[PDB]
Amino acid sequence: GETTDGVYRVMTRRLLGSTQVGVGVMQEGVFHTMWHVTKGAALRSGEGRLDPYWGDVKQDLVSYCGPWKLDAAWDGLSEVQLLAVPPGERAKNIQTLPGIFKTKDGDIGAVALDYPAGTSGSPILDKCGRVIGLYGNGVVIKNGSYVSAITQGKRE
Amino acid sequence: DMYIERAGDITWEKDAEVTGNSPRLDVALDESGDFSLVE
Numbered sequence: 389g390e391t392t393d394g395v396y397r398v399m400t401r402r403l404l405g406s407t408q409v410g411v412g413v414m415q416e417g418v419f420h421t422m423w424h425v426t427k428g429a430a431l432r433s434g435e436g437r438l439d440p441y442w443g444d445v446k447q448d449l450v451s452y453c454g455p456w457k458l459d460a461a462w463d464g465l466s467e468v469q470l471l472a473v474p475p476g477e478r479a480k481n482i483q484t485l486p487g488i489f490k491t492k493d494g495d496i497g498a499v500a501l502d503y504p505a506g507t508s509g510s511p512i513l514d515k516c517g518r519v520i521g522l523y524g525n526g527v528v529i530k531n532g533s534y535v536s537a538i539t540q541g542k543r544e
Numbered sequence: 545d546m547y548i549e550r551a552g553d554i555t556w557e558k559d560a561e562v563t564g565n566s567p568r569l570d571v572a573l574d575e576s577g578d579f580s581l582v583e
């Protein structure tokens with residue numbers, strides 16, 4: 389399979405034609421995506437197979453071939469970039485200053501950007517190109533627009 | 545049956561389109577991993 393580091397589209401042939409259900413990140417031999425994209429199903433990569441290794445529905449994350457590797461964090465002050473990979477469209481970087489989701493368990497960065505559902509799992513990066521989280525789990529605010537959490541896992 | 549296709553490198557791009565606001569929202573996270581607004 390293609391093991392090269394980078395951003396990848398997650399496709400399915402179960403529905404009409406080939407549909408893009410999400411996006412993920414390959415890093416240090418592990419594929420990182422959101423749980424709601426694959427539900428933990430096995431993934432095909434050329435002639436090779438990717439099997440889930442860790443997953444958690446509450447964090448909405450899943451890693452394949454190994455443990456979660458992404459551990460960078462938003463510094464709470466700087467602008468970031470969403471490396472959006474929309475269905476049938478080329479990868480595009482979009483710069484934004486994250487907002488905040490305030491919860492009873494602490495604060496999490498949030499990105500107010502609206503993209504098709506099949507863009508879920510696109511990485512959010514800092515100025516050093518480090519993945520600080522994935523786009524795709526959030527809320528619809530008072531006017532209909534979408535706001536995503538910057539969802540990051542834990543490197544054990 | 546799901547499959548992956550490479551879409552690009554992960555790199556910061558100088559002079560990318562700058563957009564989106566920074567809302568501060570009170571949210572709740574349920575056991576199913578769904579976020580909701582708190583008022």
Ligand SMILES: CS(=O)(=O)c1cccc2cccnc12
Pocket residue numbers: 427428429440441442443444445
């Ligand atoms: C393979 S595993 O036990 O690490 C796992 C975890 C969470 C969710 C999963 C969904 C489908 C398959 N497997 C899943």
Ligand SMILES: CS(=O)(=O)c1cccc2cccnc12
Pocket residue numbers: 502503504505506507508523524525528534
């Ligand atoms: C309401 S929804 O969850 O289908 C949705 C809407 C708008 C934008 C979205 C971006 C990513 C994932 N989902 C998105």
